[PDB]
Amino acid sequence: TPRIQGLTVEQAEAVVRLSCLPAFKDLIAKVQADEQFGIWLDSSSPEQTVPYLWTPATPIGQAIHRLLLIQAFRPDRLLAMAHMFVSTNLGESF
């Protein structure tokens, strides 16, 4: 059971899974350090403003990191994150 300071049970269930990735190791303390950053946590459009990331990173890699973050934190905007990932990989009018 992780911290339930800002997350829920369904959100924190995937946090433990995402912590197994070597790239996304600093995840449990990430929300504690960015405690004010909760726009993606509640309401608004977390798709357009996705904080944090996984060395220089390609835009595709940054989109992958944002997708992995939102898949665990905000499961509903996964469709919009996937749409933006496709647009950045292929094109805006794909």
Swiss-Prot record:
Disulfide bridge partners, by residue number: none
Subcellular location: Cytoplasm, Cytoskeleton
Assembly and interaction partners: Homodimer. The cytoplasmic dynein 1 complex consists of two catalytic heavy chains (HCs) and a number of non-catalytic subunits presented by intermediate chains (ICs), light intermediate chains (LICs) and light chains (LCs); the composition seems to vary in respect to the IC, LIC and LC composition. The heavy chain homodimer serves as a scaffold for the probable homodimeric assembly of the respective non-catalytic subunits. The ICs and LICs bind directly to the HC dimer and dynein LCs assemble on the IC dimer. Interacts with DYNC1LI1; DYNC1LI1 and DYNC1LI2 bind mutually exclusive to DYNC1H1.
Medical condition linked: Charcot-Marie-Tooth disease, axonal, type 2O: An axonal form of Charcot-Marie-Tooth disease, a disorder of the peripheral nervous system, characterized by progressive weakness and atrophy, initially of the peroneal muscles and later of the distal muscles of the arms. Charcot-Marie-Tooth disease is classified in two main groups on the basis of electrophysiologic properties and histopathology: primary peripheral demyelinating neuropathies (designated CMT1 when they are dominantly inherited) and primary peripheral axonal neuropathies (CMT2).
Family statement: Belongs to the dynein heavy chain family.
Record's function text: Cytoplasmic dynein 1 acts as a motor for the intracellular retrograde motility of vesicles and organelles along microtubules. Dynein has ATPase activity; the force-producing power stroke is thought to occur on release of ADP. Plays a role in mitotic spindle assembly and metaphase plate congression.
Domain notes: Dynein heavy chains probably consist of an N-terminal stem (which binds cargo and interacts with other dynein components), and the head or motor domain. The motor contains six tandemly-linked AAA domains in the head, which form a ring. A stalk-like structure (formed by two of the coiled coil domains) protrudes between AAA 4 and AAA 5 and terminates in a microtubule-binding site. A seventh domain may also contribute to this ring; it is not clear whether the N-terminus or the C-terminus forms this extra domain.
The name this protein goes by in its record: Cytoplasmic dynein 1 heavy chain 1
Species this protein is from: Homo sapiens
Gene that this polypeptide is encoded by: DYNC1H1
